[PDB]
Design a protein around this ligand. Structure first.
Ligand SMILES: OC[C@H]1O[C@@H](O[C@H]2[C@H](O)[C@@H](O)[C@H](O[C@H]3[C@H](O)[C@@H](O)[C@H](O)O[C@@H]3CO)O[C@@H]2CO)[C@H](O)[C@@H](O)[C@@H]1O
Ligand SMILES: OC[C@H]1O[C@@H](O[C@H]2[C@H](O)[C@@H](O)[C@H](O[C@H]3[C@H](O)[C@@H](O)[C@H](O)O[C@@H]3CO)O[C@@H]2CO)[C@H](O)[C@@H](O)[C@@H]1O
Ligand SMILES: [Cl-]
Ligand SMILES: [Cl-]
Ligand SMILES: [Cl-]
Ligand SMILES: [Cl-]
Ligand SMILES: [Cl-]
Lengths: 984, 984
């Protein structure tokens, strides 16, 4: 009877039908655009020969002239526009080619003129300049992320403020945890991160609205946004020649300031020849303290608060705070205030409103009926809407500056807390920013801070999009993730705690912090993670103010050894091993770091091991889909059962916990690497007993992995111990019986390869075999997928049926973080394997995958690949090529590590092991490197083709002297050293 | 330094300052309005002599002419408008009185002309006619609630669809449980129940937007909404003489239909002399199946679905369905479709869009840039936005009708479910509604159904607002609550299950259902609740598809005896006692209803009792604030401990569970009443042993209550057993030591009074004493508060600090449900106490409180009292007098019972015990009453003053014969009986 046609099973696309109908009467070029003319998809209207994919038909249909013209033909007749000799025609299927009227021609020419820049462009410094009218490639593309600075202050991870800002300034602003200053929105669209009023304002003249910052109409003749490092600047010009500029940034902390302040400076320049009598109404919505009640009891959120007015020492109104009745919502205190600077005069708002209904009245948010006559009524209820009003006359050629300060004070940074604390901190803030120039000086301080931070590693290549993308944008993102982990963004809006394994972000950022004088901060972070390890050696899976989920995931603790290794090898500071740090078990017990690292290794190498002596998988490891064991236990439960086991079987602590639980081969690799790291740390610390014990244990673990986890053509991913008849014994290689793809024998996990190499277990022949499998079955046109198709229902009855269409997340996506771990392995192997042809191939795959993750390349074909050209995104949809959010992800961290690795830098016992792997087409690579007490200029030259030190002739010079030792010293002479490498 | 002034701490109001500055130069009358002119509140602009409180200054300030005129004086000078001799002046503080210009005079006159009706008015049939421009008193005031009809089909409570509709048609639409058809919004404002596009549409002409159903601009010359019983009709007239009418209702179920369908009919009449070529774009937003992910993972909500197009047998597009990948979201299937009826022609949509971003484009939702050129693109992702487009030419004087059908099919009503089921049900629906007249016939069927349902009890007084308010509006609300409990509304948006104690709704509705032939449905509901009682006698606190929270709250089971009593006494159907009903414990065990009722009584009378033999309080009872015992246990835990106790101490089942837990006196009253009810049921069932046992137990329980719970001047509320030194021993009367008000000795709970009377425990002297306490300490200007101020931290030695400002919810509100239980007691006592002066006073309090809850009276002073003039609201804020939502509440149920009781109707063993209690100023009361096999016309006459049968002379006649027996027979002769009562 009735039939259903889904988006995906729709049989033909508009552009395909356009080609079918017109592809032999006109040249459709390499790119075209088209729309179906009716809901049965029988006819199309399109346009030929575009420079890239873009929604041109949509923009044309918004044009009254072209839309009316098309109605002469559509829907009954298909049509294509075509340009010949710089004039436009419309072509019909019956052959006719009609020269379109002049007004249609002008509209078509204007529309196609700059299609290649419709998603914006990057400045030389890597800043994204966006047109406020153009369509968005996707909901993360036009987004900037802002952060405060709590370095030098307490609990930096938990207290640094953070904000998200789209091209219109939309978004939200948080203090500690998920505490909302400006309101988040949890609604249907990814595009709506915040309440729509946030950061927006109106201008009035003669009682009539002339401007709204989130409405572009015909009275706006220019409107652009620029996303830069830690600030966004939005500019408009009206037809009446008002020039409006918004600058948004977070205030770096200073003693006595509120815990969170966001500054928005608005500059209004009268570029006309007549004075104008204007007024501003600045609006927003405070976040509720009662977030769960938005879902559960909206009336509660309203009745528990009221608005309150703030007055300075002269009795002048300065702004609004939402005042709460319940004590639990009085431990933070929000505020908004504004200063109007008009020539000599400084003024504060003359009126306000605090009730959204009274403000909008009979109008809309874009055209509010009460916006020009604020009612000065303090709302007895929430929500905490605010509007602040002030008049100003602006003379010809002159500018008025309005500085807004939005923020929160908190008990999280102040003992004996009450709203009196907020009032004092707000006074301190406003006094600091009393002089107009103070805002500019703070912005310059922010700019200079991030510029200085980035100097640890600077590329200088022929490609300024790459150089700025790495030197500024990626460096900023890695700082951002060190402070924020995975806890905030455009679509990351729920409360998220810090995952233990996300210590990974510090793997990349620690060098940057050390080289701006914050080595102690790095140590503090190491110790903070260490305090989340239990005596037995498992870890809290998550923490924020305190830790939770003891030993729930089996991989967590092992990552901490990589962090300590990187820190100790770089700095040679073994003193951290003697630090007495609280154990996660509490009471009031502390343990030296060295003993905690030993315990981590013992847990995974000896206690929590399965029948093959490899680490147990438990609930899951790094991969949350490996819910193979449905009766798994956490570390606290395991600890209790273990002690009962020792008592019942007369065992000794350190003996194996006996079970038929499955084993994680990825954890085995993480462990082997961790053991190697501790052996090397111990040697540096002159701890001969520990070095020897760890060296021998590494050999033993390596033997277990080789004997029990190499399965013909790959390292397995999981060993299965509960089927004593052999029905299933492993997952992750040929013969595992678990493939869901009839054309693939076995399931293959990218991380089995990656971690077998990163841990230095895989032999050269094993690498060659695995790379062959990867090329055949894991390498897609959009990069390296995480795993091939698996049918885990055969062993994990528990198993979730799928949630995703093909291409998204677990149904076949390219997870870019995992792809970057695999690239790290490809790079490491390409430097060392004996066979130069294997090395060359692995480096080709490495650069192919890097090219698919570099954010700036998202502007090459933005309406297909989307993403964000300054900030990583999490995955590539393998059906469409679209880069899909969220923004914060391990991709950025590992991309940073990988590009530095390819440039040749690895820190080792005796200095910098230098071994660069350039692109085949590159003939030069230059970069600078900072160290704590010296600096370096590196220059590499080669002919076209694959070159590497292992197999190619070369000459290496340091400070003008030819040298054979490729381990460059870590100099401490406070001089710049010149390193030159020439491949012959 | 900086100071803070809250809404509540603000010293003086605008109107107070207006009177201070002007009150003896002009007559400000009984009502005025004013606004502060600046943020320091020094000056005011106001207007004198309004007919009621209303936001007149706000509306005047939206008027460009008046706003500009005021700027000649404000902000520096205070002003008041005044009308004298039908012309307006503005008065200044210096005494100047200036005749305002003619254009300002016209604007002021027009604005004040109809202030008395700014919040709308009620038709004679109780329908609320609302102006779409006027401000709202509050966020529940302009709301209607719609319901489907699943009578005669399975799982009626769980499957009846329901919708909320404001005056603009905003809101949302649900199927079973919290399953969203059209999307709910969980955001900052109580006003936003749904995604803003829901139910809204646009009209176009020559490619330009001429109308949006949720935008009133100057091209709209009339715009009104009418909320009636189970439908809303919204009407507009454009300046171009288009007349647009929207009619929204839910389709009653028919076999083969989808489980939920909402019909919106749009009629467009061309009342001009020229044909118009128009088009409509009909929009909305499907709700997500993944509601939790709106908060947790918005990207997930998008990627798990895609849009899909629907086609009829002829290959014509008919509408859209959102298609889901995960199996858990494929068990419901949503749809939207539309039919355009233009003269002889019927047509389906010619175009669609399914991507909000493409639809809005560079515009706004009110003015979407893609609305006139839908792109016919099926979105690969959610959210499930839809727009359906169709053209039509409408000739002069003619009408085009667009019928939209939005809905969902579900596995909850169909075995072997898939989307094929939806397609078949949608086909059935569209075939049924093929002919234009079918929509009108279905609407008339709905209207007639509710009119017939209401005939159980009809008032005929001189007061059509009261008569329609009761006969139509309250009757509908009580039906609504029987099907929906407390689970849906404007601000009730989270998932809520059916509370066991909300069987109370059936106390009022059962008589209505029985008198339309649905006695079997009433029995089925009795059995459904009965299946949520455990063998031991405690109950699941909540249920929906299954029950949960076994015995968590101590009162729950006792309410079931009231439902069985009302049913059995009305119908004399004792057969229900023999029904074998599943026990809540499961394991396929059943028990006869009679034995379950016995078990309920045994649990509260013998097992779960404290040191005084009164029922234990447990976590809490009816009052969720009585968290007195911090180590309480649920019934499952108690059952386990009880059996352990019996074994340890060699006890027998039925012995007391031993503890120092506190006792609930309200539960003791509910129990005493329950026992009396079972004794009477048993006597009717000729079960002499059970009747004797219950009669004796009632005496025993009464003695326990009198001996241990009467405390000098009140029945206590809780007896406390854990302080053996006597430090605290009770809560709820003089001497309890728990008052938080230094001027009150004791805490007094309204329900201690109410239930002491409803259970026939309180003596006449106890009633006199308690009513004196109530008058002194519980009766406020806004009605009966629930409790006086208490300091429970002294015994719950640390429970929650308060959450509310004074006046709201637990901080002193008038909870209208509890107020109506107290009124039930006052009425019962007024009928029977010996002292006529006590009776008179109690009846005065009863009618005072009724007047404060009757919805239609919310239109007397609507901008102060708000509420909703057709639907109850939950509480009155005792600081402001505002009636605050939610809408569904026990208020409506008990208001219905109380008004019928006051009219004199109580069903007893031998018929109708007739004992009416009229208002003192009433001289007449007439009403009709339906019974299953007869009907009645009642007429009561009296002189002015208090009259009642107990104390006043009267003559009673039935069918023209004077009778002395005031128990009127329940006649079964299928005749109308005339009952006349004349007080002398
Ligand atoms: O519905 C039962 C009772 O509700 C009480 O209001 C409660 C709110 O509904 C509830 O949301 C809130 O609980 C949280 C809130 O959800 C969360 O956002 C915030 O972080 O903490 C709040 C702490 O409670 O609690 C209140 C009060 O308990 C009504 O007061 C009551 O009438 C009603 O029976
Ligand atoms: O965050 C860890 C993993 O998340 C996975 O997506 C999950 C969604 O975030 C989660 O919302 C969903 O769970 C619910 C959903 O919350 C609720 O609305 C609905 O009723 O049921 C959903 C069923 O689960 O689950 C998915 C995963 O199943 C990512 O897939 C994964 O990459 C990530 O590690
Ligand atoms: Cl171009
Ligand atoms: Cl994000
Ligand atoms: Cl993995
Ligand atoms: Cl509600
Ligand atoms: Cl109570």
């Amino acid at each position: 009877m009735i039939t259903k046609v889904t988006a995906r099973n729709n049989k033909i696309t508009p552009v395909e039908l356009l080609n079918q109908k017109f592809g032999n009467k006109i040249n459709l070029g390499n790119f075209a655009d088209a729309v179906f003319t009716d809901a049965a998809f029988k006819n199309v209207a399109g346009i030929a020969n575009l420079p890239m994919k873009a929604p041109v038909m949509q923009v044309l249909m918004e044009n009254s002239i072209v839309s009316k013209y098309l109605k002469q033909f559509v829907p009954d007749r298909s049509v294509s526009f075509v340009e010949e000799g710089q004039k436009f025609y419309i072509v019909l299927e019956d052959g006719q080619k009609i020269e379109v009227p002049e007004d249609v021609n002008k509209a078509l020419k204007a529309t196609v003129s700059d299609v290649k820049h419709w998603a914006g462009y990057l400045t030389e410094d890597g800043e994204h300049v966006i047109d406020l009218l153009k369509p968005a490639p996707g909901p993360h593309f036009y987004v900037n992320l802002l952060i405060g600075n709590r370095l030098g202050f307490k609990r930096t991870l938990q207290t640094t403020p953070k904000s998200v800002v789209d091209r219109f300034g939309r978004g939200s602003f948080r203090s500690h945890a998920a505490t909302q200053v400006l309101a988040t929105r949890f609604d249907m669209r990814q595009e709506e991160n915040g309440f729509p009023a946030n950061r927006q304002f109106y201008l009035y003249e003669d009682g009539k609205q002339i401007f709204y910052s989130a409405l572009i109409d015909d009275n706006i003749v220019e409107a652009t946004s620029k996303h830069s490092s830690n600030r966004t600047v939005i500019k408009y010009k009206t037809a009446s020649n008002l020039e409006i500029t918004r600058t948004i940034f977070l205030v770096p902390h200073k003693k006595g300031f509120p815990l969170a302040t966001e500054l928005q400076r608005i500059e209004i320049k009268n570029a006309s020849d007549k004075a104008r009598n204007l007024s501003i109404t600045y609006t927003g919505m405070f976040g509720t303290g009662a977030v769960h009640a938005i879902f559960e009891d909206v009336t509660y959120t309203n009745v528990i608060m009221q608005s309150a007015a703030l007055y300075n020492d002269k009795g002048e109104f300065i702004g609004i705070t939402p005042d709460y009745y319940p004590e639990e919502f009085k431990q933070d205190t929000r505020f908004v205030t504004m200063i109007v600077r008009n020539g000599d005069e400084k003024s504060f708002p003359q009126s306000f409103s605090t009730d959204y209904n009274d403000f909008v009245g009979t109008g809309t948010l874009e055209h509010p009926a009460g916006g020009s006559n604020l009612n000065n009524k303090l709302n007895r209820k929430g929500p905490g809407f605010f509007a602040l009003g002030a008049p100003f006359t602006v003379e010809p050629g002159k500018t008025v500056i309005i500085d807004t300060f939005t923020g929160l004070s908190s008990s999280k940074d102040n003992e004996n807390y009450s709203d009196a604390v907020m009032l004092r901190e707000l006074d301190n803030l406003l006094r600091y920013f009393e002089k107009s120039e103070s805002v500019e000086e703070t912005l310059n301080e922010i700019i200079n801070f991030h510029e200085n931070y980035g100097k640890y590693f600077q590329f200088n290549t022929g490609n300024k999009l790459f150089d700025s993308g790495f030197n500024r944008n990626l460096a900023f993102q890695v700082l951002y993730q060190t402070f924020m982990s995975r806890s905030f963004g455009q679509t990351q809006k729920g409360y998220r705690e810090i995952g233990f394994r996300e210590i990974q972000d510090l793997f990349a950022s620690m060098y940057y912090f050390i080289n701006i004088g914050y080595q102690d901060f790095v140590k503090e972070l190491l110790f903070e993670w260490t305090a989340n390890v239990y005596k037995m050696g498992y870890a809290n899976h998550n923490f924020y103010w305190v830790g939770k989920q003891p030993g729930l995931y089996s991989d967590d603790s092992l990552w901490l050894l990589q962090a300590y290794y990187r820190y100790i090898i770089y700095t040679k500071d073994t003193s951290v091993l003697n630090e007495e740090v609280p154990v996660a078990d509490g009471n009031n017990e502390k343990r030296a770091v060295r003993e905690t690292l030993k315990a981590i290794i013992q847990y995974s190498a000896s206690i929590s091991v399965g029948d093959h002596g490899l680490p147990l998988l438990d609930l899951a490891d790094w991969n949350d889909s490996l819910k193979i064991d449905s009766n798994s236990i956490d570390g606290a439960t395991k600890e209790k059962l273990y002690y009962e086991q020792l008592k019942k079987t007369n065992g000794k602590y350190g003996d194996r916990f006996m079970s038929d639980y499955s084993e994680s081969v990825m954890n085995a690799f993480l462990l082997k690497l961790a053991i190697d790291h501790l052996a090397e740390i111990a040697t540096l610390d002159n701890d001969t007993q520990l070095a020897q014990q760890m060296s021998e244990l590494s050999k033993e673990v390596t033997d277990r992995i080789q004997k029990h986890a190499w399965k013909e053509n790959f390292f397995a991913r999981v060993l299965i111990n509960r089927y004593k008849d052999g029905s299933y014994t492993y997952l992750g290689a040929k013969g595992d019986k678990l493939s869901a793809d009839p054309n693939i024998d076995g399931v293959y996990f990218l991380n089995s390869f990656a971690w077998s190499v990163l841990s230095d277990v895989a032999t050269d022949e094993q690498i060659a075999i695995m790379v062959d499998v990867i090329k055949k079955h894991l390498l897609t046109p959009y990069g390296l997928r995480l795993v091939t198709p698996a049918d885990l229902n055969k062993i994990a009855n528990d198993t979730a049926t799928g949630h995703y269409f093909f291409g998204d997340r677990e149904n076949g996506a390219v997870f870019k973080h995992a792809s970057m771990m695999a690239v790290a392995a490809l790079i490491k192997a390409a430097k060392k394997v004996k066979d130069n042809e294997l090395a060359k191939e692995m480096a080709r795959i490495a650069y192919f995958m890097i090219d698919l993750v570099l954010p700036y390349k998202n502007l090459e074909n933005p309406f297909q690949v989307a993403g964000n050209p300054r900030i990583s995104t999490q995955y590539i949809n393998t059906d469409t090529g679209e880069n899909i959010g969220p923004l914060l992800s391990g991709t950025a961290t590992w991309l940073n590590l990988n590009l530095i690795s390819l440039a040749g830098i690895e820190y080792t016992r005796d200095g910098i092991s230098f071994n660069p792997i350039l692109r085949e087409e590159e003939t030069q690579l230059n970069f600078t490197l900072k160290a704590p007490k010296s600096s370096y200029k590196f220059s590499i030259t080669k002919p076209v083709g694959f070159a590497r030190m292992e197999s190619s002739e070369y000459e290496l010079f340091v400070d003008g002297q030819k040298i054979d030792n490729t381990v460059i010293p870590m100099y401490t002479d406070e001089k710049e050293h010149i390193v030159t490498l020439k491949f012959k």
